[PDB]
Coordinates of C-alpha atoms (C1' of nucleotides) in Angstrom, one line a residue:
Chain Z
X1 CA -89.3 49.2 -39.9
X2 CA -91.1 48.5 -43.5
X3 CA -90.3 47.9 -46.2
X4 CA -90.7 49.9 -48.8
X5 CA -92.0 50.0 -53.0
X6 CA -88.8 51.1 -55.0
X7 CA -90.2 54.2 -57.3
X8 CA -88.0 54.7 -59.9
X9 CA -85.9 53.6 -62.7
X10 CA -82.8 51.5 -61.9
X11 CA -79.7 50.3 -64.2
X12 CA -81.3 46.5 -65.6
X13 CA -77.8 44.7 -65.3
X14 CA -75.2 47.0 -63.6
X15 CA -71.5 46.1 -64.1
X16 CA -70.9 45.3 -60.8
X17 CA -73.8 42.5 -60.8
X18 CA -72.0 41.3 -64.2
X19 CA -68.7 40.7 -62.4
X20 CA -70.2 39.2 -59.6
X21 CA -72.1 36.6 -62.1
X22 CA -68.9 36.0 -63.9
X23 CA -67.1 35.2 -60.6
X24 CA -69.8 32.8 -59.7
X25 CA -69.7 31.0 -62.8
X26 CA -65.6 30.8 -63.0
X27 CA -65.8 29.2 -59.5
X28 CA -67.7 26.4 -60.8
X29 CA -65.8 26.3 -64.0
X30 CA -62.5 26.7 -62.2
X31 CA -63.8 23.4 -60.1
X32 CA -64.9 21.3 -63.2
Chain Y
X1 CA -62.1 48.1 -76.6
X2 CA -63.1 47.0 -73.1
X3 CA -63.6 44.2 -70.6
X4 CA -65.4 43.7 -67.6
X5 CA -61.9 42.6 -66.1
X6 CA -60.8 46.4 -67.5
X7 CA -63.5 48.0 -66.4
X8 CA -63.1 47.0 -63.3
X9 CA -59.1 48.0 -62.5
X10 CA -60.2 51.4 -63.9
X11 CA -62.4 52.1 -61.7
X12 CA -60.3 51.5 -59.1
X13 CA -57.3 53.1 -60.5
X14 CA -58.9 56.2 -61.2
X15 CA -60.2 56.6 -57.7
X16 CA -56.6 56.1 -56.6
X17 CA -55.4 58.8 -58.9
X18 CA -57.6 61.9 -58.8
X19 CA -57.6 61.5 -55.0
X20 CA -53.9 62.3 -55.3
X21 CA -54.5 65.1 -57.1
X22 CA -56.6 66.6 -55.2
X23 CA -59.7 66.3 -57.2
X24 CA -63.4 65.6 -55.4
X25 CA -65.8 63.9 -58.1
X26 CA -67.7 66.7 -58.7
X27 CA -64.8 68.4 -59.2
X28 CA -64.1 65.7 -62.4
X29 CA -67.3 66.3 -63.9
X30 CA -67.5 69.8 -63.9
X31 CA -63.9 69.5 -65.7
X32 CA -65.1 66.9 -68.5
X33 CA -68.0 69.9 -68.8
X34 CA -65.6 72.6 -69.8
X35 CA -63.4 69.6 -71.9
X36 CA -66.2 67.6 -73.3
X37 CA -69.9 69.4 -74.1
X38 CA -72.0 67.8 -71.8
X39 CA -71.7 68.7 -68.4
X40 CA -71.6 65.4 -65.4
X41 CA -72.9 65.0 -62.2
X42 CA -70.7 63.5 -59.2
X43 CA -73.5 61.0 -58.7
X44 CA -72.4 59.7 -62.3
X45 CA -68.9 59.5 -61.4
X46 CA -69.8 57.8 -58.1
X47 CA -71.8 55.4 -60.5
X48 CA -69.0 55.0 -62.6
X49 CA -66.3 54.2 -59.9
X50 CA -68.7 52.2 -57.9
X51 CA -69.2 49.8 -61.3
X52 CA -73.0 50.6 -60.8
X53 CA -73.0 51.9 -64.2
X54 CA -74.1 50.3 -67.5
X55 CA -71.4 47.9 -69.5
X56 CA -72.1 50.3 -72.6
X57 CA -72.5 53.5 -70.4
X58 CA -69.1 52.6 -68.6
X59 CA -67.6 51.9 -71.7
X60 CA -68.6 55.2 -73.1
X61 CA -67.3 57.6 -70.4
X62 CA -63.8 55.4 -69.7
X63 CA -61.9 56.9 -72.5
X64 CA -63.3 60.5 -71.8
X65 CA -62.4 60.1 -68.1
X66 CA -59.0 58.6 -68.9
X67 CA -58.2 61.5 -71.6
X68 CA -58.6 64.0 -68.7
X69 CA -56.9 62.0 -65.6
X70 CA -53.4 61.1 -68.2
X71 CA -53.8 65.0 -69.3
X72 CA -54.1 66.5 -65.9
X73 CA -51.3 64.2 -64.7
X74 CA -49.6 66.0 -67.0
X75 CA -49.9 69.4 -66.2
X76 CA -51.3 70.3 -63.0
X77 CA -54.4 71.4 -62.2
X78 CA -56.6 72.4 -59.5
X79 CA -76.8 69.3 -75.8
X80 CA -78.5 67.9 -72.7
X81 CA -80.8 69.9 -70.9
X82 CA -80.5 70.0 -67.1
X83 CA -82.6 68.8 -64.5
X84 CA -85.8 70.9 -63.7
X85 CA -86.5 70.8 -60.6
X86 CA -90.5 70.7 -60.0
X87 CA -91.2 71.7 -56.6
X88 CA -93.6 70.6 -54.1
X89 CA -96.6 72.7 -55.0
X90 CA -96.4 71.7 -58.6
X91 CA -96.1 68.1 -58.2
X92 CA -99.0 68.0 -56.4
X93 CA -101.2 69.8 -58.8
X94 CA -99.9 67.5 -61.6
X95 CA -100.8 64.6 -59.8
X96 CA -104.0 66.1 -59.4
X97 CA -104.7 66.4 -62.7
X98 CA -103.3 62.8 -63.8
X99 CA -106.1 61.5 -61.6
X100 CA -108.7 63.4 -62.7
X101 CA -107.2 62.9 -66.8
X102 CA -104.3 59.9 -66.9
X103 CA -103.3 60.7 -70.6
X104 CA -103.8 64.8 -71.1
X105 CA -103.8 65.6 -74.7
X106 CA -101.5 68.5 -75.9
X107 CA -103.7 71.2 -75.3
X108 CA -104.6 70.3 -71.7
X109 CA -100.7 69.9 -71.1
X110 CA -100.4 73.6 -73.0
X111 CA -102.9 74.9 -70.5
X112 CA -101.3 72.8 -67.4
X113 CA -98.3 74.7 -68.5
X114 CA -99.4 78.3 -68.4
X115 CA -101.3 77.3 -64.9
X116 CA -98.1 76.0 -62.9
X117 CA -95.6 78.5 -65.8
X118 CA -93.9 75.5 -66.9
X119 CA -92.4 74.2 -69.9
X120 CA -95.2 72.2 -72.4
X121 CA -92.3 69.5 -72.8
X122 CA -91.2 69.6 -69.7
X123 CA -95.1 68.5 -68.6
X124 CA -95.5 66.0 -71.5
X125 CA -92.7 63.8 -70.5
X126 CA -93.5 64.2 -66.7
X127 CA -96.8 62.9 -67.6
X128 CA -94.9 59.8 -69.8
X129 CA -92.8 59.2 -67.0
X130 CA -95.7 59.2 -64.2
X131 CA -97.7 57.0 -66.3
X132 CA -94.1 54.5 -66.3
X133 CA -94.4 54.6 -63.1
X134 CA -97.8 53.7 -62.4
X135 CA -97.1 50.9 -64.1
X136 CA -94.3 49.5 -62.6
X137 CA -95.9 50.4 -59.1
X138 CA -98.7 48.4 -60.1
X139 CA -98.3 45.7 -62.4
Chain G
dT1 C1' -67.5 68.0 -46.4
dG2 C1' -67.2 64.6 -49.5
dT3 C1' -69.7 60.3 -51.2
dA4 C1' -73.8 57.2 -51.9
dT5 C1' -78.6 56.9 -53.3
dG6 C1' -83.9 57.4 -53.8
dC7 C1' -86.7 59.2 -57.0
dA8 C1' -87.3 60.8 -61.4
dA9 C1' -86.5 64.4 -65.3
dA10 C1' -84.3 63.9 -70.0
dT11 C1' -83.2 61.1 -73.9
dA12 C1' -83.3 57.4 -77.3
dA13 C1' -85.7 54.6 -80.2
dG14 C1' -89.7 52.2 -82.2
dG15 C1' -94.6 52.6 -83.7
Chain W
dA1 C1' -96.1 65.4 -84.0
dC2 C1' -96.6 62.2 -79.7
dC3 C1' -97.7 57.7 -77.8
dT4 C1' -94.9 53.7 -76.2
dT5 C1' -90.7 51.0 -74.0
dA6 C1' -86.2 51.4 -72.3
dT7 C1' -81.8 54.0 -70.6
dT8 C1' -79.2 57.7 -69.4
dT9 C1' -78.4 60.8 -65.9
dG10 C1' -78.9 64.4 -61.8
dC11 C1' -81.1 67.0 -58.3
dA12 C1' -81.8 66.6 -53.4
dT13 C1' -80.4 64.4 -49.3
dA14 C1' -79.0 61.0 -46.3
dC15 C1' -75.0 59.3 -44.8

DNA sequence: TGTATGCAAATAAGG
DNA sequence: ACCTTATTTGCATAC
């Protein structure tokens, strides 16, 4: 199997990647 | 007002709710069409449930969606052009003639129109969104 | 038979 | 007007 291009127009910063940012930086501010 | 931590537990909630009731997505949308103007799509609800939405476009459609989940709790129940759908044949000619002219003026997308009985508007944003794409295909 | 998704029409907002 | 860039959406279709 290939890979292929993506064609086509995508949400830039979907909430679901926000959250998941936000949970990676409260586990390093949770730890300091 | 809304938060990502909001926005979140909606998503989930509502999901949990208009199963329930009975309700498919599509079946949501084409309720918010006959409450709100604008008629939407299950794959925006999908979107919306599935946080794969904007912040801003999340934020926008929460209230509407939450309006219509408390009312049909309740009691029980159960400006934007649409889609055209350019079939095989015509995309091919069009991308015919974006190789042979990339950036048709308005009279060759007139005459592009009459030739494949299309929509002049229609044709000039499919040429503004073909040449988009070119150039995220190749930077 | 619903739900997720690739690809892309429609829209918004500057020149 | 219509070019641009940048988002909002929705057919069609694979799951």
């Amino acid at each position: 199997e290939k890979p292929k291009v993506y064609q086509g127009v995508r949400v830039k910063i979907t909430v679901k990647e926000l959250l998941q940012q936000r949970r990676a930086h409260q586990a390093a501010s949770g730890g300091t | 007002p809304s938060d990502l931590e909001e926005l979140e537990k909606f998503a989930k909630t509502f999901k949990q709710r208009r199963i329930k009731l009975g309700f498919t997505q599509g079946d949501v949308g084409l309720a918010m069409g006959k409450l709100y103007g604008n008629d939407f799509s299950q794959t925006t609800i999908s979107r919306f449930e599935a946080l794969n939405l904007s912040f801003k476009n999340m934020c926008k459609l929460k209230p509407l969606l939450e309006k219509w989940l408390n009312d049909a709790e309740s009691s029980p129940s159960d400006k934007r052009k649409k889609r055209t759908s350019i079939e095989t044949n015509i995309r091919l000619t069009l991308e015919k003639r974006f190789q042979d002219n990339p950036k048709p003026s308005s009279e060759e997308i007139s005459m592009i129109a009459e030739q494949l009985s299309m929509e002049k508007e229609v044709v000039r944003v499919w040429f503004c969104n073909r040449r988009q794409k070119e150039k995220r295909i190749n930077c």
